[PDB]
Amino acid sequence: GSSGSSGLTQQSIGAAGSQKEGPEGANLFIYHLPQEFGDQDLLQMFMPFGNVVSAKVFIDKQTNLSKCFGFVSYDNPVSAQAAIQSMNGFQIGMKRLKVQLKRSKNDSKSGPSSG
C-alpha cells in the first residue's frame, strides 16, 4: 500500500494548502487520516475522482502534527459526491477513512422554473 508516482504532469492549479470552496452545497471533509498522508497526497488522492477545487490539511496545536483530517471541495455537489460514494469508508493501510461534505440545513438551489 501507500503507492505513489512522480509522473511529470502539466497540471498547475494551485490548490494544495487552500481554505477555498466550491458552490453552495458542494463540500468534502476527510477524517481519520494516517501520518504518512499530508497535504498534496489528499489532493492527488481525490484528483482521480475529478478536478478538486480545494484541498488542505489541518495541524494539531499541541503535537504540531496533522490533525488526521483535511478539507476539500469540488466545482459542484454532483462530482463531490462521486468521491464520498467510494472514499467513504476507504480502508487505507490498516484503518478506514471518513469523508463527508459539510452538512447543509437550508439549501436553495435555483433550478428550472416555469417548466
Side-chain angles (χ1 to χ4, degrees):
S2 294
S3 297
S5 274
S6 63
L8 210 284
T9 309
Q10 274 166 118
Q11 286 187 20
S12 186
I13 301 156
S18 294
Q19 271 271 81
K20 292 187 78 83
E21 53 89 50
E24 197 55 81
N27 330 96
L28 284 184
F29 280 81
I30 300 77
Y31 304 105
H32 303 244
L33 281 167
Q35 191 189 89
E36 34 156 314
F37 270 51
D39 317 339
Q40 274 279 24
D41 301 312
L42 191 67
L43 183 73
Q44 294 190 287
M45 174 83 127
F46 280 48
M47 266 208 209
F49 290 84
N51 210 281
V52 175
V53 173
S54 85
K56 157 180 179 193
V57 162
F58 282 51
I59 299 287
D60 279 305
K61 276 88 78 81
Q62 297 284 328
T63 53
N64 40 285
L65 287 165
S66 196
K67 282 203 189 179
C68 311
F69 80 73
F71 176 55
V72 171
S73 282
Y74 280 48
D75 165 74
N76 36 60
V78 180
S79 281
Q81 276 274 345
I84 296 166
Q85 276 198 296
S86 273
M87 299 313 296
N88 175 263
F90 180 103
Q91 166 150 25
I92 189 171
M94 281 190 61
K95 51 172 172 65
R96 295 171 200 85
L97 296 180
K98 170 206 211 210
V99 199
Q100 189 163 271
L101 80 79
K102 204 83 168 277
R103 186 166 185 277
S104 292
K105 271 190 85 176
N106 36 29
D107 196 319
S108 286
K109 279 165 84 272
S110 54
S113 307
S114 58

